[PDB]
């Protein structure tokens, strides 16, 4: 049922700059632990509690601390997002860690509402955490004090959360696990508006982007909508798409759905440009732009470079036979990714 | 004026005859019909379930009816069903409305799909997608073709508890059922997923039984991965420090029983809050009022909190309700089992005043029989009465014709084969017939038993038996002899209590001995019978017919059936020969096993076992050696060989067809047998007394959700067997086999679990107090039998 | 008998001492039926009679049952009341 590895005449040779192993990884457990690049330094971690810091050029150890005691797994599954000399990691034991970027020591720790699966989001002096029990909390960047807490309504059957809230003009636009994308004030946590995007075939059974007063959010079933930043009213609707995560480049939208097919849409009405169904029914991660091409890693451990204007495969390379689960990172002209065993990979 | 129906007419009637459609019409030929009666007529033809598009309209003077019948189902072919066979898929559809020969509503095709999907959510196929394909035919027909597709299943991958600090997360998930952390192959509990359903109530009872009276479960999330093949479970809890029970106040309508309720709701202040102690008081009131004739008493408890003293005052509300009487007690679904079989397991009587608990216990006694597949209760209000009710039990019977084989393994007896066939409802009278056999390294047994559980209307049982047993002593680590035996045993079982039961009955047993190696102790019994065999021959034979009266008493107050942590088990079995038999003896066996805990959690148990056995002759004769008692092995005293504890054989100088060629023998004339010979071969005795004492400990190298499955126990086993008829004077050169002071002791470690191969039990012992001839067997196991 | 298990045997009527006072001679069936109702035994045929049998023989002893017999007339009005602490 899984579409086999497509045959690609490599336009160029995809290579591994450096490869550093980090802990035992996350395994077959669906987490979100992906590396984070900042000031030529790569921060990655495994679930067990091991947190490292690597050089973005060669991948050498600067510091390597563990977040476990007498060991019991720290259960890191949320992160990592790095800002302001702080490394924020969310665990499944209702904890939020803040590590200094210098030595890797704990600045502060905060007991949250539930399983912090969502990657932390840093806007203003607040750290946005979205737990599994539908509790959007904002922890103070300074000391970690829980400033406010928003109860996003819980569904019957649940998914792995999840939504990393985006922020624009006083508000934190976040998605729900029920099918509603919400917008709340950053200081009070006050509800502004709510919009429902989901269809119900009873009883048969998510990071948003703000582009010029337009909020883009995708439904858990795979319905796409453009939302007005002010009212939250739906502008246009298309019934295709899904998790994992999408990205918006200028006036085009590239995304990967439940059936793991890659396609490009227009920012205007969402019309189709091209559709790639050769990586069909594999387990691709999120797509990210790296020097003109779309980069996606599947479950077998192959990366796939795709031409953005026709959907043609540019390149294909075996990187780690352990496979790929978490999302890649393409910043500072670099390209990172973490296999299921915890090994971090720089590309080309 | 309209509309005078001069005539009726139909168009489109195929299967539905004219009379069948002319029947359901609320308007008929000759009537005066307007738009209100036509709308009622159309909606009436629709409620017949024969058409999908009905149309009634006027002609000049004739009321014309146009219809289009529902497509008749020609066949239902399945395609892609791997987990479910085609035959049961048929029956589940027929019990839902759709079947061959009948018709389908094309608006219910989607409901058939999602209806069959739901069956794949009963089991773990959360990705199932059954597609229905409808295809027309020459005449008004249709072939339903259900396309099945399941990519599955889901092993729930993690169970996590958030908000716990008093107890570790792994320790809490050790008590349920259903777990999923790590499904180790050791470990038996398997990790699939369905409705919990009250697995929180165990976690609820865990905190509540230890004082946390405010313990509240905020939310429970059952997570799914993007691939619909992975399940998580997250339960958020909120514990509540320490709470002492200060007092209990009773409120509500008490039905004038305030005097005795204060007793049921009394406490000794101040002691720790206990949930099951509160649940007990709730049911004690419900049972007290039930005694005073109350059908549905309702008792509720709410803990009023005192944060100042960290104590809890229990608020209890009582509502006795009303009285109800049972008119008839009916039984539906028993096409085989006669009425008396089901009605004999009741505690709510017909006519008598109603008791809700008495009805529920009626359901419990029925499924405990295991005669039925499902047992449903239904208390119906008798028409035209405020109180009289009918308690009806609906049952779907279960096939009690079972073929059951079995294999085993253990140092005590090697590989063991159990094979037979039992019918627990022949032919539906409650009787239990069964031809069962077994195979062992030193014993083969086969029987034919018939048992009536309700010989009397009170519960006394009468069981018949017809057996056949072969015994080889040389393979049982004893002095070489063979005892071929058979006979019939009838017995009565007296349930004097749910904690105690008595046994009594007669029995005939024939023992044909053969191939007995001549030795002093064995030969002494032969003289007492009146036999004089050769002390130089291996060949011999002895047929003995015996009639025996038997009595037995079994006491069991163990809390848990598998791993006892508190309680005691006592069994006493006695035998005696009634005059007229060849032998004249009596035998009394006593087995005791008591468990005593020493903590709140009952994870430190001190087990003490004792086993007593004694028997002797009556009128000059002596107790048969094939009724001797033995010790040593996996069950009696660990650290010794099987049946090696006790007397040893003193063989006579003999010569036999062996054929005396080259290898080892015992006191053989060719190997120079001039006089009596001391041996290591045990024979057991007519007097045995062993006593064990083990310290059950928590298993120390796995602190996951495991330790509550495996049980370690450091033991100190000891015992002794002797012969109260051994002439210590005539054989002064040989050890005294009549002294009970020879106590053999031992000590070691044990292991227990239920494995894929079966229930295992390891035991590494060591005999520090041993005597001459005692063969040591330190490592012992048992895989099945 | 002596030592056998014989669960609990009750029969259809529970009569407390403070509920037999509600019935005074001259009442209809309705009143008697919502005071203590419904008396399970009405015998054929010519006579009307409500037989209330507080039948408590669940244990091995007693054997403790008190019976309450009521008699009306042709128009369903209480004429006779018969209470008896049986049985000795």
């Amino acid at each position: 049922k899984m579409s086999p590895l497509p045959t690609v005449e490599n336009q160029f040779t995809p290579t591994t700059a450096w490869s550093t192993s980090v802990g035992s990884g996350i395994g077959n457990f669906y987490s979100n632990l992906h590396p984070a690049l900042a000031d030529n330094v790569v921060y990655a971690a495994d679930r067990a509690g091991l947190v490292k810091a690597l050089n973005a050029d060669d991948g050498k150890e600067i510091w390597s601390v563990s977040l476990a005691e007498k060991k019991e797994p720290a259960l890191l599954s949320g992160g990592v997002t790095v800002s302001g000399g702080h490394v924020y990691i969310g665990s499944e034991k209702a904890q939020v860690y803040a590590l200094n970027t210098s030595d890797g020591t704990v600045a502060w720790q905060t007991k949250v509402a539930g399983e912090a699966l969502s990657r932390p989001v840093v806007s203003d002096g607040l750290v946005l955490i979205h737990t599994s029990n539908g509790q959007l909390q904002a922890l103070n960047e300074a000391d970690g004090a829980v400033k406010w807490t928003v109860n996003l309504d819980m569904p019957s059957l649940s998914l792995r959360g999840e939504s990393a809230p985006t922020t624009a003009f006083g508000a934190a636009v976040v998605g729900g696990d029920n099918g509603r994308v919400s917008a709340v004030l950053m200081e009070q946590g006050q509800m502004i508006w709510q919009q429902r995007i989901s269809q119900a075939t009873g009883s048969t059974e998510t990071t948003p982007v703000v582009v010029n007063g337009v909020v883009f959010a995708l439904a858990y079933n795979g319905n796409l909508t453009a939302l007005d930043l002010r009212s939250g009213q739906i502008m246009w609707k298309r019934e295709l798409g899904s998790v994992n995560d999408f990205i918006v480049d200028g006036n085009r939208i590239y995304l990967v759905d439940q059936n793991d097919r890659v396609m490009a849409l227009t920012i205007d009405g969402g019309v189709t440009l091209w559709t790639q169904s050769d990586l069909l029914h594999r387990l691709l991660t999120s797509p990210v732009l790296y020097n003109g091409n779309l980069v996606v890693g599947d479950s077998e451990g192959y990366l796939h470079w795709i031409n953005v204007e026709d959907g043609r495969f540019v390149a294909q390379q075996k990187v780690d036979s352990s496979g790929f689960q978490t999302e890649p990172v393409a910043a500072d002209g670099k390209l990172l990714i973490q296999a299921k065993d915890g090994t971090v990979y720089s590309i080309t | 004026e309209g509309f005078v129906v001069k005539d009726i007419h139909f168009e489109g009637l195929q299967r539905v005859a004219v009379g069948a459609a002319l029947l359901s019409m609320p308007v008929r030929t000759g009537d005066t019909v307007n738009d209100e009666d036509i709308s009622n007529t159309i909606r009436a033809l629709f409620a017949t379930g024969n058409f999908e598009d009905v149309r009634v309209l006027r002609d000049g003077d004739t009321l014309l009816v146009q219809v289009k019948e529902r497509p008749t189902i020609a066949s239902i072919t399945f395609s892609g069903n791997k987990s479910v066979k085609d035959d049961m898929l048929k029956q589940n559809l027929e019990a839902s409305g759709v079947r061959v020969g009948e018709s389908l509503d094309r608006t219910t095709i989607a409901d058939i799909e999602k209806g069959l999907e739901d069956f794949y959510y009963s089991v773990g196929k959360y990705s199932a997608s059954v597609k229905a394909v409808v295809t027309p035919l020459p005449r008004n027909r249709v072939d339903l073709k259900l396309v099945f597709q399941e990519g599955v299943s889901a092993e729930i991958q993690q169970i996590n508890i958030v908000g716990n600090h008093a107890f570790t997360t792994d320790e809490l998930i050790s008590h349920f059922q259903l777990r999923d952390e790590v499904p180790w192959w050791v470990g038996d509990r398997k990790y699939q997923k369905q409705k919990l359903a009250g697995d929180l109530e165990t976690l609820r009872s865990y905190y509540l039984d230890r004082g946390y009276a405010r313990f509240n479960i905020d939310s429970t999330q059952v997570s799914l991965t993007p691939d619909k093949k992975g399940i998580y479970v997250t339960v958020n809890i909120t514990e509540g420090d320490q709470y002492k029970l200060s007092g209990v106040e009773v409120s509500g309508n008490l039905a004038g029983h305030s005097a005795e309720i204060e007793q049921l709701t009394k406490i000794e202040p101040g002691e720790l809050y206990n949930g099951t102690k509160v649940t007990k008081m709730e049911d004690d009131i419900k049972k007290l009022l039930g005694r005073y004739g109350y059908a549905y008493p309702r008792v509720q408890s709410m803990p009023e909190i005192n944060d100042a003293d960290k104590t809890v005052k229990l608020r209890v509300n009582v509502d006795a309700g009303n009285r109800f009487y049972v008119r008839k007690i009916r039984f539906e679904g028993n096409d085989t089992s006669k009425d008396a079989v089901l009605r004999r397991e009741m505690r709510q009587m017909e006519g008598a005043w109603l008791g809700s608990d008495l009805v529920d216990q009626g359901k419990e006694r029925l499924n405990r029989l295991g005669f039925f597949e499902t047992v449903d209760t239904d208390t119906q209000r008798v028409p035209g009465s405020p109180d009289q009710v009918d308690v009806v039990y609906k049952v779907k019977e279960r096939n009690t014709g079972s073929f059951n084989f079995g294999i085993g393994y253990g140092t005590e007896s090697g590989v063991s084969f159990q094979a037979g066939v039992q019918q627990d409802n022949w032919l539906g009278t409650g009787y239990a017939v069964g031809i069962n056999g077994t195979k062992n390294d030193y014993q083969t047994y086969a029987e034919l038993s018939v048992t009536n559980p309700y010989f009397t209307v009170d519960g006394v049982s009468l069981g018949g038996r017809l057996f056949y047993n072969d015994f080889q002593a040389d393979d049982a680590d004893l002095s070489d002899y063979t005892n071929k035996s058979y006979g019939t045993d009838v017995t009565l079982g007296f349930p004097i209590n749910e904690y105690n039961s008595l046994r009594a009955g007669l029995g005939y047993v024939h023992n044909s001995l053969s191939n007995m190696q001549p030795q002093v102790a064995m030969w002494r019994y032969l003289y007492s019978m009146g036999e004089h065999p050769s002390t130089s021959d291996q060949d011999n034979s002895f047929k003995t017919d015996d009639f025996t009266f038997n009595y037995g008493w079994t006491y069991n107050k163990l809390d848990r059936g598998y791993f006892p942590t508190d309680g005691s088990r006592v069994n006493l079995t006695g035998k005696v020969t009634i005059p007229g038999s060849d032998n004249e003896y009596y035998k009394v066996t006593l087995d005791t096993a008591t468990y005593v805990p020493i903590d709140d959690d009952h994870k430190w148990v001190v087990l003490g076992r004792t086993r007593w056995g004694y028997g002797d002759g009556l009128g000059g004769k002596e107790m048969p050696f094939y009724e001797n008692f033995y010790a040593g092995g996996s069950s009696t005293v660990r650290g010794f060989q099987s049946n090696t504890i006790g007397p040893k054989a003193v063989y006579f100088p003999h010569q036999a067809s062996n054929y005396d060629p080259d290898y080892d023998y015992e006191c053989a004339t060719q190997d120079g047998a001039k006089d009596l010979c001391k041996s290591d071969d045990a024979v057991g005795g007519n007097a045995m007394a062993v006593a064990s004492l083990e310290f059950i400990t928590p298993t120390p190298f796995i602190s996951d959700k495991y330790a509550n499955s495996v049980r370690t126990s450091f033991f100190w086993d000891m015992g002794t067997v002797w012969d109260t008829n051994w002439d210590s004077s005539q054989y002064s050169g040989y050890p005294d086999y009549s002294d009970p002071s020879n106590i053999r002791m031992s000590a070691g470690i044990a292991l227990q679990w239920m494995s894929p191969l079966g229930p295992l039990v390891f035991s590494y012992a060591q005999p520090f107090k041993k005597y001459d001839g005692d063969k040591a067997e330190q490592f012992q196991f048992n895989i099945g039998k | 008998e002596r030592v056998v298990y014989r669960p609990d045997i009750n029969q259809g009527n529970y009569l407390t001492a403070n509920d037999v006072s509600k019935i005074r001679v001259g009442m209809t069936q309705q009143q008697v039926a919502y005071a203590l109702g419904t008396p399970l035994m009405s015998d054929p045929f010519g006579t009307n009679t409500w037989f209330y049998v507080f039948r408590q023989q669940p244990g091995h002893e007693g054997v403790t049952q008190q019976t309450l017999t009521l008699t009306f007339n042709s128009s369903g009005v209480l004429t006779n009341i018969d209470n008896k602490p049986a049985l000795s």
């Binding site: - | 069948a20 005449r139 085989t336 009425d339 008396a340 009587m349 008598a352 | 009527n13 015998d43």
Partner: protein
Amino acid sequence: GSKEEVPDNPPNEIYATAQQKLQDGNWRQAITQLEALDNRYPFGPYSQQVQLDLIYAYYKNADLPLAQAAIDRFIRLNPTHPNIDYVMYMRGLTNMALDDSSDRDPQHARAAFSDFSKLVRGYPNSQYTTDATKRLVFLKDRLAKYEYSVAEYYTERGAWVAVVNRVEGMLRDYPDTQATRDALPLMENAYRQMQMNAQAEKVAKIIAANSS
């Protein structure tokens, strides 16, 4: 070990073949020939004969749950057919065959009693009335015999109130049955156990005035 599939044969050929399978006694193949004949032509000029012949085939081949279903279909679709009286009769035989020949969930004979009753009420001069009446006498006897067995157990148990209420129920519904007269001493005794000699005497008067 029957054979399932059916060839695409001429209309009369199959029916003439199915007939010979019916006249001989081999019902298993008679069904299969007819079951495919009705599953290809449901509203022919004589397709109602096929429905009639099917019911007879299921009944003689011990296929009762299939017989009842075909019976209900013929009644629902043809409630005024000239031979609907015969279908009602076969309906009664089916429920009667689902019985004892024994207090084993008597609803199958209790439902059979209703099926024959509807036959004799609407069709007194039916060709099956006399035999149906012979069965009605037997069905009424065991429906009373069921209550007797329930009364006999409660007699052994000691539920005297349940006994007399059951015999009263017997005397009400089944007064002219054999089991009723045999249940009369059970009612008298249950009265004497509750010290109701005034009532047991009434029962004794009835027993003395009647011999069974």
